[PDB]
Amino acid sequence: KILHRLLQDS
Amino acid sequence: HKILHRLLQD
Amino acid sequence: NSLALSLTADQMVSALLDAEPPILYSEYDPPFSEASMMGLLTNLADRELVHMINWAKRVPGFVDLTLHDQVHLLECAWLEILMIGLVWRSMEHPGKLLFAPNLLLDRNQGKCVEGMVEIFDMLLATSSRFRMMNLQGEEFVCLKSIILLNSGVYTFLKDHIHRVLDKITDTLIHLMAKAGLTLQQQHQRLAQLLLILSHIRHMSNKGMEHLYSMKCKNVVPLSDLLLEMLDAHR
Amino acid sequence: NSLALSLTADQMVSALLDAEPPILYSEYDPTRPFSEASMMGLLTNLADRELVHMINWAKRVPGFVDLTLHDQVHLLECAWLEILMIGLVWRSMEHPGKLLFAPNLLLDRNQGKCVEGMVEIFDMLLATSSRFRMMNLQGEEFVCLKSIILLNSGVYTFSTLKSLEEKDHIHRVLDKITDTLIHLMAKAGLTLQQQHQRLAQLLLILSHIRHMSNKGMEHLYSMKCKNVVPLSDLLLEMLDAHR
């Protein structure tokens, strides 16, 4: 889920 | 044309 | 000029309360299938449309619009109004949807029709939100009429409608200050009520998409008036 | 506790204004008369890069980081096209009859007829821009409305007994943003009656913005099956969240 990763970035 | 016309004038 | 802008806040509520459409009954002698339940709901909705149209005429300011404008507002908001009535009726029946006094349904029964369980949950959720907000009948008739005048006002390709919309806002605040809410509580409750109208619109759209597929699936023969309401959304 | 419930009205405005994503540019070439499928590629490419800024903008919105990851995923999946649309309507406010997708991409209603089915959605976006122009919408009010859409477009679409507490905290932030709007209107020299009217007029447009998103979302799913638009991996996961 791309939205999961982008919300978890840094 | 439309039944909605008739019901709005009665 | 219209006769609606001159009405007092209490004179606005009395006009809306008296214009309120009646609660109709479902066809008696019914477990349900996909075809039988959609038949009951279609026949109930088809009969409610006729009362709604006459309820719209008795809404202050709606008769002062052109016949074409009255058609547009109803065509775009007819399912929204039906749903906010259902959500209102189902308020004192947690977990259930009071479609008619003789037709009370739960989430399980929505599963007999594909895609109905999603909209059922949203309708139940809205009903729970009204119950926790302790929505009053005077506030409900304002919200319903706002849906009538606002849902199709930005699709006229209008100053009179927004003047009446402001009048209903004055009426809503009048109801809250009369019940004893502080100024801060007034505009917060105002905002919460109007934000729910966004979800009611969402429910109508997801529902309209579902009604057009079944007219294309021919699950139940729909009436001519209900098909003209459906076709008005492409 | 929470950082959103402690913010004041002016600090709320500052945070939101400071969180504003930038206005991205498009790869539009005016020397090439773009067709329907090429014009779709520009908007899909632009919306894909805007989602990345929106995702990091949502983090900066007060209260949003005080939610679970599954709740954050839910809200964005439901509101992404709504937030894109109200941003577009805001950028187009001083371009009557046109939609400012990018500073180098200004589209006409006739140019919207290029793509099949875009005309009706273009006209609704244009009318929404006309409505903000008549109201003289302020930027401080826009940033409030945008973060309301984020927290509201999925708050009734969750819920178990444990996740019910998360619903109550979202409304506490919503009620905080509502105070912020009223604080703004009172600062602009508006009477109590005027503040309530304008507050209502703004939140009613959110009903139309939801309508545009829904009708727009339905149009996006058709083109995925039509397979006319170029590639976009995040938009597919966002579009399938509504399917």
SS3 C96: strand
Which tokens go with D109? 């209603």
Query: Are residues C98 and C89 in contact, defined by beta-carbon separation less than 8 angstroms?
Result: yes
* Domain range annotation of chain C: 1-234
- The answer to whether D91 is a known ligand-binding residue is yes
- The strand pairing partners of C106, in sequence order, are C96
Residues near D211 by beta carbon (within 8 Å), at least 6 away in sequence: C151, C201, C205, D124
For domain C1-234, give the fold: Retinoid X Receptor (1.10.565)
Would an 8 Å CB–CB cutoff place A6 in contact with chain D? yes
Instruction: Pick the closest to residue D53 from D87, D28, D78 (CA basis).
Output: D87
Burial class (CB in 10 A: 0-12, 13-18, 19+), D191: exposed
Using the Cβ of D13 and the Cβ atoms of chain C, whether some distance falls under 8 Å is answered with: no
Residue in chain D nearest C152 by alpha carbon = D208
Whether D210 has a binding-site annotation, put simply, is no
Residue type, D45: N
Question: Chain A: residue nearest D76 by CA?
Answer: A3
User: Which residue intervals of chain C are DSSP H helices?
Assistant: 9-18, 34-57, 67-89, 116-133, 137-150, 159-179, 183-215, 224-231
Query: Which residues make Cβ contacts (< 8 Å) with residue D143, sequence separation at least 6?
Result: D13, D16, D17, D19, D20
Contacts 24+ apart (CB under 8 A), D188-197: D188/D138, D192/C183, D193/C170, D195/C187, D196/C169, D196/C170, D196/C173, D196/C186, D196/C187, D196/C190, D197/C166, D197/C169, D197/C170
Experimental method: X-ray
Burial class, C141, CB count within 10 angstroms (exposed 0-12 / middle 13-18 / buried 19+) = buried
Contact C207, C119 (CB under 8 A): yes
Closest by Cα among C16, C21, C1, C5 to C86: C21
The CATH topology of domain D1-243 is: Retinoid X Receptor (1.10.565)
Residue with structure tokens 């982008």? A6
Q: Cβ(C122)–Cβ(C203) under 8 Å?
A: yes
Instruction: Write the DSSP string, C7-28.
Output: S-HHHHHHHHHHTPPP-----S
Whole-Å CA distances, D171 to D2, D177, D178: 13, 10, 10
Question: Are 3 or more Cβ–Cβ pairs between D and A shorter than 8 Å?
Answer: yes
Q: C46: burial class by Cβ within 10 Å (0-12, 13-18, 19+)?
A: middle
Q: Do chains A and C touch (3 or more CB pairs under 8 A)?
A: no
Resolution, Å (one decimal): 2.5
Interface membership of B5 toward C (CB under 8 Å): yes
Quick check: D207 contacting C, CB < 8 Å?
A: yes
D122 Cβ contact partners less than 8 Å away, ≥ 6 residues apart:
D99, D107, D109, D112
Indicate the residue of C54, C56, C67 with minimum beta-carbon distance to B5. Answer: C67
CA of residue D93 relative to chain centroid, distance = 14
The letter for the amino acid at C105 is L
Query: How do beta strands D98-102 and C103-106 pair?
Result: unpaired
**What distance in Å separates the CA atoms of residue D211 and residue C48, rounded to the nearest whole number?**
23
- Residue carrying the six token digits 């004041």: D8
| Gap between the Cα atoms of C34 and D47, Å rounded | 40
Task: Please answer whether residues C183 and D191 qualify as being in contact, where contact means their C-beta atoms are separated by less than 8 angstroms.
Answer: no
Residue C222 CA to residue C43 CA, distance in Å, equals 8
Cα C36 to Cα C53: distance, rounded to the nearest angstrom: 26
Cα-flanking dihedrals φ and ψ of residue C152, to 5°? Answer: -125, 20
The two structure tokens encoding residue C229: 């309401």
Q: How far apart are CA C119 and CA C213, in angstroms?
A: 15
